[PDB]
Structures are given as structure tokens and as C-alpha cells.
Amino acid sequence: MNISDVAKITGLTSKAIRFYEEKGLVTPPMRSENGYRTYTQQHLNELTLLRQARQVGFNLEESGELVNLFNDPQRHSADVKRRTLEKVAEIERHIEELQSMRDQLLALANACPGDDSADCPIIENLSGCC
Amino acid sequence: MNISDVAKITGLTSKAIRFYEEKGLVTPPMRSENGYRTYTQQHLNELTLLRQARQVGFNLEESGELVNLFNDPQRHSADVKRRTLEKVAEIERHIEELQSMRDQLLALANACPGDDSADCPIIENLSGCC
Amino acid sequence: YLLEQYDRVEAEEARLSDLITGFVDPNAENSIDPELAREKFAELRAQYVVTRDTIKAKGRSHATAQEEILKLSEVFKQFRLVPKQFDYLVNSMRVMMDRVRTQERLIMKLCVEQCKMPK
Ligand SMILES: [Cu+2]
Ligand SMILES: [Cu+2]
């Protein structure tokens, strides 16, 4: 297909698609003799899958595995959902520890006078001196 | 102090340390008969603070600026305080992002049977079929 | 011939790009879908399989064998020329003739320079 039309349909740009093809993340689109990457409705839906996969959180690798899932009409909804849920768990850990960090930052900052002082208690809490 | 000294004392590794050095985060240390960086308490303090800029979550640049403020006692406690607040604002961004899209992952879990079906509707909503 | 090239390009299950755009493509006197091509590339196969048998029907130049020659031609003459790929189809004549021709010249190089011969 026309490569720009395809990239606008999927929202990406051409070097994004090319990066993904470099990483072997879709069915191979042919070229034409002039060299235009022959995309498809197959590549349409592969790229839309690979698009929302990372916006969800699936990296280059596991999103390539999702396009493997789609290209596998033998696929098993179980393992799909199990990986969905492993992702839920990893996001949960991420949330929990980021908020632990947040809480530590807030304990630092509210403990600060913010009295435009050389006596910035935060940094000296951060630095191993005295 | 050789690099092992401040490395094993503050706790950072030689690669990350020289990286932080050539980054210009930290003072150019003194040098030797042989150019080995004979560190001092200066650099130890700088590096403990530079970690607790990292482990707190500051990027390398803002972290370098933390250590620059520290040994620059004309710093203002208020400036560091607002910095920490802005960083926690970004943490709120990151965590609410994860919360929202993880709630949607849970909706995805709610939608799929996860029953080894090659009609896994997850692949069907992502890959924009029909 | 063009049926061969069209299967060679259809060897890996797919193409709608330019090299088909040169192929048979009857203009109603331009990407090509599968079924239309598969049809247009089929009755030509029928003319061949019904034509190649009569070449031996009491000679290369038999009345109804020449009828199938002229009819295969007429089957093609509604259609148009096909792309620069067809260049090599012409080359497959020249590179034969270039050789065949040359051998005659070579035989003459062996027959005509040393000894006398009539002309
Ligand atoms: Cu302060
Ligand atoms: Cu399913």
C-alpha cells in the first residue's frame, strides 16, 4: 500500500514502521520495484495491534509476540489473558514503589522550611556529611 | 582516595562514577603521578548526594544541579523545596497514568474468556478487526 | 511466457504492485485484484492446452493448427503489450539467434576462408 497512507491510518510514521520491521515485529511487507513497502490489511491490523500494545505497555518484544498471537489463528485466549494479568501485576508493583518514592519525597519537602536559606534540610538529608 | 575508595564507601560502581564525572556532575578531582583520581571527602559527599538524587528519582542533570547547590551555600531551601514538589507532581502523573490504564487492563481481563480460544477477543479489539 | 512470469510473481502467494500493472489488463475500449487476473490468465491457458496439441496435427502448419495459432493470436490482440519485463522475452530470441546466427557465421568461418566454395 501507500506507505504514508498506511502510517497515517495507524498514526505512526514510516521510520516507526521500519524500526518495527527491523525488529521483526510484523509480517514482512514486500517492496515494489521502485521500492515502496507493500503494506496490507494484514499489515494494517498487525500495526494497529503493535500500536496499542505498547500504549498498553507491551514492549517491542512482547508486542511482537502479540502479532505472533494474531498471526497464530491457533491462538489460546488463556495465555493472552495470563500475560495481560502479569502486566497488571507489574504495573501494580510500579505504582506501589513509585508512590513509596513519592511519600519519601513528600516527607523530605514538607520537612523543609523553604525559608530561602542556606539551611536547606533536604540536601543535607540527602548528602552523607556531618 | 582511589575510585575504589569512594566507590565502596558511597556505594557506586566505577563505570557509573566516571560516567558521572565526564558528565561534569561532580568536581574534576585531583590527579596523580599516574593520573589516578585521588578523591577526597568533597567527592564522597558529592556522590552520596548524587545517589540520593538518583534513588529519589532525579534525572542525571537535575541531580548534578543538586550536588552543585549543596557545595554552593548560596542555595535556597525554598528552591529545593519547589523542585521536590514539581518532581512529586510528575510522580502523581506517572502513578495516575498507571492507575488508569491498569484499570483498563482489568476491564480487558473482564472481557476475555481466557479459555484457550483462538477467538481471543483481546487480539480482536487491538488488531482492529471488524 | 507471460503466464510463466505471472506465476513466478505469484510464487509467494501475493503481489498487486507495478509488475502486474504491465500485464494483460484488457482496457475497456490500476491495481489488479486476484480473481480478475486469475480469470484473464486462464482462458489463455485454455487456448494453449487446446493449441499445443494440434501443432503435431499432420504438421506445424496444418489448417486447424494454424486456426489455433491465429485464434490464440486473436485472443491476444484484444489485449495490450506487457511491461519492460517482456524485454527478456525478446532477449530469449536474440540470445538464441545471436548464438544460432553466430554458429552459421562460425561454420562459414570454418568453411569459407580456407578452401574455395561456390556462392
Ligand atoms: Cu531546604
Ligand atoms: Cu480470549
Curated annotation (Swiss-Prot), chains A, B:
It comes from the Bacteria. InterPro entries: CueR, DNA-bd_dom_put_sf, MerR-type_HTH_dom, MerR_fam. Residues 4-23 bind DNA. It holds the Pfam family MerR_1. The keyword Transcription regulation applies. Disruption phenotype: Loss of Cu-induction of copA, forms smaller than wild-type colonies when grown on 2 mM CuSO(4). It is found in: Cytoplasm. Cu(+) binds at residues 112, 120. One of its GO terms (molecular function) is DNA-binding transcription activator activity. GO terms for cellular component: cytoplasm; protein-DNA complex. CDD domains: HTH_CueR (cd01108). Keywords: Activator, Copper, Cytoplasm, DNA-binding, Metal-binding, Transcription, Transcription regulation. SUPFAM superfamilies: Putative DNA-binding domain. One of its GO terms (biological process) is DNA-templated transcription. Residues 1-69 form the HTH merR-type domain. It contains an N-terminal DNA binding region and a C-terminal metal binding region. Homodimer. PANTHER family: HTH-TYPE TRANSCRIPTIONAL REGULATOR CUER (PTHR30204:SF16), REDOX-CYCLING DRUG-SENSING TRANSCRIPTIONAL ACTIVATOR SOXR (PTHR30204). Regulates the transcription of the copA and cueO genes. It detects cytoplasmic copper stress and activates transcription in response to increasing copper concentrations. CueR tightly binds Cu(1+) via a linear S-Cu-S center. This is HTH-type transcriptional regulator CueR. It comes from Escherichia coli (strain K12). The gene is cueR.
Curated annotation (Swiss-Prot), chain C:
It is found in: Cytoplasm. Transmembrane segments: none annotated. Contains 4 domains, connected by flexible linkers. In the active conformation, the domains are in an extended conformation, each making extensive interactions with the RNA polymerase catalytic core. Interacts transiently with the RNA polymerase catalytic core formed by RpoA, RpoB, RpoC and RpoZ (2 alpha, 1 beta, 1 beta' and 1 omega subunit) to form the RNA polymerase holoenzyme that can initiate transcription. Identified in a complex containing RpoD, the RNA polymerase subunits RpoA, RpoB and RpoZ, CRP and DNA. Interacts with Rsd; this prevents interaction with the RNA polymerase catalytic core and with promoter DNA, and as a consequence, promotes transcription from promoters that require alternative sigma factors. (Microbial infection) Interacts with Escherichia phage lambda antitermination protein Q. Belongs to the sigma-70 factor family. RpoD/SigA subfamily. Sigma factors are initiation factors that promote the attachment of RNA polymerase to specific initiation sites and are then released. This sigma factor is the primary sigma factor during exponential growth. Preferentially transcribes genes associated with fast growth, such as ribosomal operons, other protein-synthesis related genes, rRNA- and tRNA-encoding genes and prfB. This is RNA polymerase sigma factor RpoD. It comes from Escherichia coli (strain K12). The lineage of its organism: Bacteria, Pseudomonadati, Pseudomonadota, Gammaproteobacteria, Enterobacterales. The chain holds residues 143 to 299 of 613 of the full protein.
